[PDB]
PDB file of C-alpha atoms in Angstrom:
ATOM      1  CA  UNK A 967       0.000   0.000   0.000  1.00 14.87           C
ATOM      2  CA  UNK A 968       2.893   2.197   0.928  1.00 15.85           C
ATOM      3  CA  UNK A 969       4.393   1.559  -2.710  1.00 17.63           C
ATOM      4  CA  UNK A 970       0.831   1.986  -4.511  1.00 15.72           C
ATOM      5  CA  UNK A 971       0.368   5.487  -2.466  1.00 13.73           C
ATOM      6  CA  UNK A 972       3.553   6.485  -3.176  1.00 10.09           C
ATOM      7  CA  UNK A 973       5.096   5.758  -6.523  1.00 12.24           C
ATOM      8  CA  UNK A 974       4.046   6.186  -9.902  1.00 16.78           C
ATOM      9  CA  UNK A 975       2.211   3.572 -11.810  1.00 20.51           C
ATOM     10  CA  UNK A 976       5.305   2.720 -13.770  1.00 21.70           C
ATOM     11  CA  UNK A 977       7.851   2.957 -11.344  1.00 22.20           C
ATOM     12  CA  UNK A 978       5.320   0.755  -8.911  1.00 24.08           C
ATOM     13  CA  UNK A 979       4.823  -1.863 -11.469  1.00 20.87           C
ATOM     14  CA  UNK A 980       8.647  -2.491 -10.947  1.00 21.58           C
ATOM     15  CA  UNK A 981       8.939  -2.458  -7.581  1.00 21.61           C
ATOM     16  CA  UNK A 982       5.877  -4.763  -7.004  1.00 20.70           C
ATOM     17  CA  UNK A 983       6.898  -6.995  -9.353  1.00 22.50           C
ATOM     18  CA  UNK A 984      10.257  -7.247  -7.469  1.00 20.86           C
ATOM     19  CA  UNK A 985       7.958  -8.271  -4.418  1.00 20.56           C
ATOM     20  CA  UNK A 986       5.886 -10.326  -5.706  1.00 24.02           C
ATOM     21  CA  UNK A 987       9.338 -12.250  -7.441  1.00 28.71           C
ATOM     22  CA  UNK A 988      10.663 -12.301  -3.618  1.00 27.13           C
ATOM     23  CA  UNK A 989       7.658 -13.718  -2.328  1.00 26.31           C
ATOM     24  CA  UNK A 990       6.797 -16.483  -4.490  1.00 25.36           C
ATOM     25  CA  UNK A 991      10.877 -17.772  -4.238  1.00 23.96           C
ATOM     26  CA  UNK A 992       9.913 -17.543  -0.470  1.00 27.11           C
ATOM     27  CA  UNK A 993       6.422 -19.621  -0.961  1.00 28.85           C
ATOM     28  CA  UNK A 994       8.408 -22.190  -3.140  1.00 29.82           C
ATOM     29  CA  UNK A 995      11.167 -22.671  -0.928  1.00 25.50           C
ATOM     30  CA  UNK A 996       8.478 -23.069   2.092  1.00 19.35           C
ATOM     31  CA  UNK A 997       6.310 -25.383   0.182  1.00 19.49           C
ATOM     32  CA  UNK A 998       9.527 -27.576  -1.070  1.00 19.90           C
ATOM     33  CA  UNK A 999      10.720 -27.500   2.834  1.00 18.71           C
ATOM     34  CA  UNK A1000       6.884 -28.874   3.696  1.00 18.92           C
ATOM     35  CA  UNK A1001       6.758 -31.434   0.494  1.00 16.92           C
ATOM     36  CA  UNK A1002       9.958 -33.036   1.673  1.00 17.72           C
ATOM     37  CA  UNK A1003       9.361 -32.450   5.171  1.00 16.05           C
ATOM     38  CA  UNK A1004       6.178 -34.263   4.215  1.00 14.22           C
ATOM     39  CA  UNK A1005       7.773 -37.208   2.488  1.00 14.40           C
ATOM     40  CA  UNK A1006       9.676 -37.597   6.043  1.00 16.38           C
ATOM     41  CA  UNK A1007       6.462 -38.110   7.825  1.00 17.97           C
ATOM     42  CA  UNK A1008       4.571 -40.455   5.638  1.00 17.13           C
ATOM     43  CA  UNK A1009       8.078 -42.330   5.986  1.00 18.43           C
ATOM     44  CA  UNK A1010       7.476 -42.577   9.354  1.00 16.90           C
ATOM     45  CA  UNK A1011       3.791 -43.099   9.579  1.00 19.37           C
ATOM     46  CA  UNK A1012       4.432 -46.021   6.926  1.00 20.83           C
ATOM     47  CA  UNK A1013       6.678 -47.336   9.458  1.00 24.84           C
ATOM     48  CA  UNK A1014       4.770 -46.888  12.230  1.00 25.66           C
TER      49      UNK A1014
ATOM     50  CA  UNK B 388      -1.519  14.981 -34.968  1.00 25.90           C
ATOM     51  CA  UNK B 389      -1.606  17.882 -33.490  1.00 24.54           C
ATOM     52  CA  UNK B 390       0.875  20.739 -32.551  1.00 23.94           C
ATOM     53  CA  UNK B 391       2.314  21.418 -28.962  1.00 25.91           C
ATOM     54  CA  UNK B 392       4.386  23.399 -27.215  1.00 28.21           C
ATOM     55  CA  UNK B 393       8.210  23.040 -27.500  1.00 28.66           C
ATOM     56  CA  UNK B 394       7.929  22.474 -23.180  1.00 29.91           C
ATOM     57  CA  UNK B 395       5.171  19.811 -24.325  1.00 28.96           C
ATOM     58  CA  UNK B 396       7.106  17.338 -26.100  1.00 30.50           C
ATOM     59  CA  UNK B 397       8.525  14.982 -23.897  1.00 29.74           C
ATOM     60  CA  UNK B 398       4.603  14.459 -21.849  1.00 28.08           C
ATOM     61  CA  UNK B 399       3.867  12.200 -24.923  1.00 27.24           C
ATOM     62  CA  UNK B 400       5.812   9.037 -23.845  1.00 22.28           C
ATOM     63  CA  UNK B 401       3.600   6.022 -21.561  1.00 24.91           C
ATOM     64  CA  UNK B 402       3.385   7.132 -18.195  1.00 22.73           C
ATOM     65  CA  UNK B 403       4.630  10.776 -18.068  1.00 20.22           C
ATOM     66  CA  UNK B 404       3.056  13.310 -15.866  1.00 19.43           C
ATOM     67  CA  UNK B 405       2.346  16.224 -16.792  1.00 19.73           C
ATOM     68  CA  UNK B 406      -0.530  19.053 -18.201  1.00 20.15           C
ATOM     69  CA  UNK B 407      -0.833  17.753 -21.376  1.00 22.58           C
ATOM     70  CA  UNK B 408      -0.602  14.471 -20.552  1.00 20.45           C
ATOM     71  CA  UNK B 409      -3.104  14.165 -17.927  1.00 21.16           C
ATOM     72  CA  UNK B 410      -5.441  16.869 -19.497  1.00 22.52           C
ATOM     73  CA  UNK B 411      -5.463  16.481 -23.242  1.00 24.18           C
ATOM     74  CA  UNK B 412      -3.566  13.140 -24.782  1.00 25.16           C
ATOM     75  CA  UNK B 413      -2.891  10.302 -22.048  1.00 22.25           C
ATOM     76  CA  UNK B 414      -0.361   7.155 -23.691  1.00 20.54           C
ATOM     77  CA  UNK B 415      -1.303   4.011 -22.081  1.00 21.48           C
ATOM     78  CA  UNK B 416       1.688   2.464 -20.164  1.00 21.46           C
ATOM     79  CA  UNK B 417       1.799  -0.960 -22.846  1.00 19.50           C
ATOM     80  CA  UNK B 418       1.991   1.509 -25.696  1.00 22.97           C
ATOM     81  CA  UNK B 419       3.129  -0.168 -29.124  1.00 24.84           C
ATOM     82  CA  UNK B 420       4.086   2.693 -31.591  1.00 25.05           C
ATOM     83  CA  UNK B 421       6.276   5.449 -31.976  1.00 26.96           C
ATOM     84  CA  UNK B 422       6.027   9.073 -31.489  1.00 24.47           C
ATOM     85  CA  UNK B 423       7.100  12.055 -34.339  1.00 22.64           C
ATOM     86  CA  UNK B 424       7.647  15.544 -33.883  1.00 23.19           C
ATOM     87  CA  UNK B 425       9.505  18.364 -35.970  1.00 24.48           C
ATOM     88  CA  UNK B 426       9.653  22.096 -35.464  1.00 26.59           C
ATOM     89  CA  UNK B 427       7.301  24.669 -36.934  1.00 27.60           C
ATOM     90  CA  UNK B 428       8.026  27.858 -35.991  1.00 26.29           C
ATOM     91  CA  UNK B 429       8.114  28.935 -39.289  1.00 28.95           C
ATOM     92  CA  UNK B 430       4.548  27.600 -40.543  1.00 32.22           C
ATOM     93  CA  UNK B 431       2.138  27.885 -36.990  1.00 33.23           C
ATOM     94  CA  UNK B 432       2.842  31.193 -35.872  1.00 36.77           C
ATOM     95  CA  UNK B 433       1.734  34.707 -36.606  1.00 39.52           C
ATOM     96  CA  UNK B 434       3.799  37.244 -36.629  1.00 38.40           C
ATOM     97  CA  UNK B 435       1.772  38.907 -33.629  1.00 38.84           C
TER      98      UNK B 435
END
């Protein structure tokens, strides 16, 4: 919102995009951690 | 077409702020064109 309010629409297109590109490597690398993190679990549910 | 001021010329470009471009011609930001200008002084102006 800060961005939006602030910057123009050009100049904000940039920056969010920069964001939104930092975010989704963040939601990737937590839904990777979870997958395998996942893949340990069922590994031990099997074996329970 | 149309003919501006010599101030005037850069406000056509996508995104620029200014009177012109808010007031009389606005370029979208995904513009695909080009935009040409030449002097005139000797053609549009009176001599008062």
């Amino acid at each position: 919102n800060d961005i939006l309010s602030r910057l123009d629409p050009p100049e904000a297109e940039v920056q969010i995009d920069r964001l939104i590109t930092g975010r989704l490597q963040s939601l990737q690398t937590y839904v990777t951690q979870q997958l395998i993190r996942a893949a340990e679990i069922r590994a031990s549910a099997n074996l329970a | 077409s149309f003919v501006i001021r010599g101030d005037e010329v850069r406000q056509i470009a996508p995104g620029q702020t200014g009177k012109i471009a808010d007031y009389n011609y606005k370029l979208p930001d995904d513009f695909t064109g080009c935009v040409i200008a030449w002097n005139s002084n000797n053609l549009d102006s009176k001599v008062g």
